Amino acid sequence: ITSAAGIISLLDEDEPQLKEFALHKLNAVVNDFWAEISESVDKIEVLYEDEGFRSRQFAALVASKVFYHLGAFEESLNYALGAGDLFNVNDNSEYVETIIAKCIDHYTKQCVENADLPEGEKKPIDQRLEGIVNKMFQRCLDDHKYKQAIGIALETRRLDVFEKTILESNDVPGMLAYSLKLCMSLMQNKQFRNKVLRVLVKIYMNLEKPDFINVCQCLIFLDDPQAVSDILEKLVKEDNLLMAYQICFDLYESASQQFLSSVIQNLRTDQTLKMIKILSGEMAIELHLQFLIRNNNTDLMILKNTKDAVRNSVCHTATVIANSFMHCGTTSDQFLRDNLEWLARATNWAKFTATASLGVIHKGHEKEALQLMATYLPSAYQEGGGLYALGLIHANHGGDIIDYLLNQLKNASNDIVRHGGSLGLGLAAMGTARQDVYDLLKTNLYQDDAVTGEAAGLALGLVMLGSKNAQAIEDMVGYAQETQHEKILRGLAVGIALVMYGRMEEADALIESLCRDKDPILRRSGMYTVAMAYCGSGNNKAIRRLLHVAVSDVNDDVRRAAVESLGFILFRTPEQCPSVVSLLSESYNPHVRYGAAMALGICCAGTGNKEAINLLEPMTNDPVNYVRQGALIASALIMIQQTEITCPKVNQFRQLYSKVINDKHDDVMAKFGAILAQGILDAGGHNVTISLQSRTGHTHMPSVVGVLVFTQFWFWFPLSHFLSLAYTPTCVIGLNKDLKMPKVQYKSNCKPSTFAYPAPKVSTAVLSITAKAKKKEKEKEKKEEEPNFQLLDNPARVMPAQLKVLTMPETCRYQPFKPLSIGGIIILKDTSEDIEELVEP
């Protein structure tokens, strides 16, 4: 029966063996009678408290079990850890499972604390805690799949057991890539990110064949230009080349300009010149330009039926940029040449906009562009806009062109010319961190010429983009709270926002200072700065800050910016974005609604979510006009390069755009948003897409920068062309050798059908006798009597959502070597001799 617990009195004796027997019996019967031993408490504890007792460990185990039954695990862990061996190593009972779970929770919390302060100040860890933790690690390792020990380790830092897990049998190294995914998806500690990446690259290096793609995509985060430079050097000296060519191509497609400049500088300290040429991006830019030119197809019919619908309002400017979006990087000014009287029908800043559109059409033309800009436009507005457009062409790719703009700013009329020249110089020298350009733009800002300073702020932000120069931010803010001309404040807003791009918590004191500043433009700038500093990673602290500002602040502009920052904060996880903004879209004030629409447009890039589309469906009927314009622009941005089979609202939204643009009594801003949406939907001739994410899951800094300064068009129309930096070509290039583009034939896996390029009186009844007449006429009349795939060549455009439905050209003699499951540029593994089919148009 065992219905009594008088054995506890055996602990009250003095002989040791009595206490040992009582402790053993209690441990045997803890699971049932914990009610009585709950009152013993101290009598057991003193047994462990005395050092001279023989079996203090058994007493500690009994007390731990009793406390666990009570529920106060914070002491059950202590008393279990105090006991040794038989305490938990049995790993058999549910009590053991609970104790190990709780103690390893304590261990991981303590590991986080130690990682916070690793400067010797880190608190010590009981060696028994480490022992049970790594015993659990080894048990779950030798037990089954090792994809749980890795997660526990990266939770508790513990890079040693991480390396042990990956370096053990590990089944296949594929899980390593899975770990990499975790390292880039479900962790926000940059300090831990560095160590995890270093471990990953070391593990890649010690393999028989290092995974060059993974190590390069880790080193781009690690910011080690000399490391990847010597990696390329040893790859070349290993007679590999092809993989080095690839690694360079993804390096340019993902890494920042300064990283590539440092890499080429280190390489400068036969094959090496080719390496430098493709690292500078000449070949990549030429290939992208060739793909855009050859695959250019813009439906001028929609532009025709729009240009006859404009009532000579200001919307012409929007059309001026809309076709530009449809002709970005396609060098196709066919509409501009064909329709020229209306091109000249607009002047003042519209001339600036037209020249900017002409330049942005000729995006990435490189050597030709210098004389090309003069050919069409050889008038302060004209020259300023030409300088701005030349800056547009060489976006992040200026080089010697920078020098031109440099001198082209010194000889300026201190007017619109200076504004355009500064904007172009800042755009082209994006992130170059050159001291001379910074000093010249600082002088331009100090000129205090309103519009000139307005452009100088953006230029100084672009040149200092993500630089975190203390001098830069100091001078910028010192001018920010010293000058009038609120336009210059608007420029300096984005200027200081861009200097802190993606820096995370590198300096949040500036965000606090900007949010606490009295000037409303300064608070708007603070929200923009938090958006730029926390791009990608959905840091909930920053999202909470901006939501609180958007809900509590009094200025409508800062609320708009705070809501718009949601896109910049959540583009990496587009699913969460409609959830939060499901109701931001229904505020009592319309500014928050516009911010909600813009955030919806920014966060999900081109995903056919059909949830953001659903939210924007009724909002485009809002009585307020500018919220309708923002909704139209956002719906266009989310719905680029999509069709009816992809989502059932593309044709409906196209005809809605037409029916609002052709309307006459609607607000000018509503039709402005309509034509902007028309330009965005078919932007780039159905050949480019906007995506802040890169191919390898990296954040594309030019894309986010450009979309931010495009959303900054409420205060300045000329900034709209900046959206050009957000487009990425949706192409895959069949380049095998250094200069060969063989006609390799590969198909797709389109299941149901094909998709992609979309589109190119009354009679009265008189029922008296009409029925009889018709029936007798009827008697008189009686008396009278799909593919599933497409063959493609080297410059083949592939939809971003269709990047996984391709087929390996195994039927062809030549098959690629790089994993062909994503867009960009790939390599082709060339088979045996008799190589032919050379294409070079």
Partner: protein, 32 residues
């Protein structure tokens, strides 16, 4: 997989908490 589920759940819980806090603030402002 299991760790992925755990991290999904943590992130979703934090996001829901942020949304709830914003709702309480906006309810207060709407009452005002």
């Amino acid at each position: 997989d299991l760790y992925s589920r755990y991290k999904k759940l943590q992130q979703e819980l934090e996001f829901l908490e942020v949304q709830e806090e914003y709702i309480k603030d906006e309810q207060k402002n709407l009452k005002k």
